[PDB]
From a paper:
Mammals possess seven sirtuins, SIRT1-75, which share a conserved catalytic core domain but differ in their N- and C- termini. [name] is the only primarily cytoplasmic isoform6; however, it has also been observed in the nucleus.
Upon screening of crystallization conditions, we obtained crystals of [name] in complex with a thiomyristoyl peptide, referred to as [name]-[name]. [name]-[name] was synthesized as a mechanism-based inhibitor of SIRT1-3 and SIRT616. The [name] (PKK(TMy)TG) consists of five amino acid residues with a thiomyristoyl group attached to the central lysine residue. The [name] fits well into a long stretch of electron density observed between the N-terminal Rossmann fold domain and C-terminal zinc-binding domain of [name]. The thiomyristoyl group of [name]-[name] is accommodated by a hydrophobic pocket formed by several hydrophobic residues of [name], including Ile93, Phe96, Phe119, Phe131, Leu134, Leu138, Phe143, Ile169, Phe190, Ile232, and Phe234. This conformational change reshapes the binding site, which may better accommodate the thiomyristoyl group.
Residue numbers in the entry:
A (entry chain C): 1 to 5
B (entry chain A): 55 to 138, 141 to 292, 306 to 355
The structure:
């Protein structure tokens, strides 16, 4: 859902 | 698991694409398709454009694109932005344009913020800009949300004055999705419809490391062929090599050459190079 990595 | 590719090669993918069974292609694209424009891949291991930013003493390079760090220390990001519009779309971009003009393109999902897909002539309907765009900018405070155009932002960036809202003095942020921010609603809305009906996933220039974007490879049905055009294998679920491999194909090299090799096989090499030439000459003559 949240931009990660 | 129905088997739709006769063989797991580029030629097999090319034959499937020319078949009646392949009507709907989705492209997932990342930083690899824009590196020949000159936009460096900022997650690649050997990347060569944080060089200048040593003065800002970053906790680590990636912090520059973290929303929490950015809001308290915007300067490193804008100094990077001044080094980098001047970029024309690449062969990869025009190959997608070609897929659209031939009626194969269902959608292009892009991780990139450079807007090169729109310049190449993909319309807004055909694009899901998963991480937003540099094109428009906004004051970060909920109760102001003043919009500023690229024109305004570039003036601020080139003068090395941190962009600030003329009304409420808050930070002005380009409409991109920083790490730790939410993706546009369009991304979640389009994925629910698009992936039910897709006949081929083309994954170009992405190491599939950024979530949730990377999870899009899982969303197509199990029979859907998936071609990875990239410098190295990625998304390994993507099964290229095991004895259970049935639908995923890897073409390892620079994305531009992959698109030329693929286009060659479809009989479009000539139309593609002609398109690229005309589109570039039109941007030059601007
Ligand atoms: C998520 S992967 C998006 C990260 C944002 C990268 C921004 C790169 C610096 C801006 C360079 C300007 C290009 C026209
Ligand atoms: Zn404001």
């Amino acid at each position: 859902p949240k931009k990660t990595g | 698991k129905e088997r739709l590719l006769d063989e797991l090669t580029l030629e097999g993918v090319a034959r499937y694409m020319q078949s009646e069974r392949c009507r709907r292609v989705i492209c997932l694209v990342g930083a690899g398709i824009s590196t020949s424009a000159g936009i460096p891949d900022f997650r690649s291991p050997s990347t060569g454009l944080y060089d200048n930013l040593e003065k800002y003493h970053l906790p680590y390079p990636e912090a520059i694109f973290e929303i929490s760090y950015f809001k308290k220390h915007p300067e490193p990001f804008f100094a990077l932005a001044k080094e980098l519009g001047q970029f024309k779309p690449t062969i990869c971009h025009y190959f997608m344009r070609l897929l659209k003009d031939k009626g194969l393109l269902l959608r292009c999902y892009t991780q990139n913020i450079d807007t090169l897909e729109r310049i190449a002539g993909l319309e807004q309907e055909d694009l899901v800009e998963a991480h937003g765009t540099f094109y428009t900018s906004h004051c970060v405070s909920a109760s102001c949300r003043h919009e500023y155009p690229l024109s305004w932002m570039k003036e601020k960036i080139f003068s090395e004055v941190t962009p600030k809202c003329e009304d409420c003095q808050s930070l002005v942020k380009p409409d991109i999705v920083f790490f730790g921010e939410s993706l546009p609603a369009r991304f979640f809305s389009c994925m629910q419809s698009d992936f039910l009906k897709v006949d081929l996933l083309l994954v170009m220039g992405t190491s599939l490391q950024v979530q949730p974007f990377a999870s899009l490879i899982s969303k197509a049905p199990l029979s859907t062929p998936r071609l990875l055009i990239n410098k190295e294998k990625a998304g390994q679920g993507m099964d290229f090599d095991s004895k259970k491999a049935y639908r995923d194909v890897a073409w390892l090299g620079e994305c531009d050459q992959g698109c030329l090799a693929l286009a060659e096989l479809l009989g479009w090499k000539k139309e593609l190079e002609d398109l690229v030439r005309r589109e570039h000459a039109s941007i030059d003559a601007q």
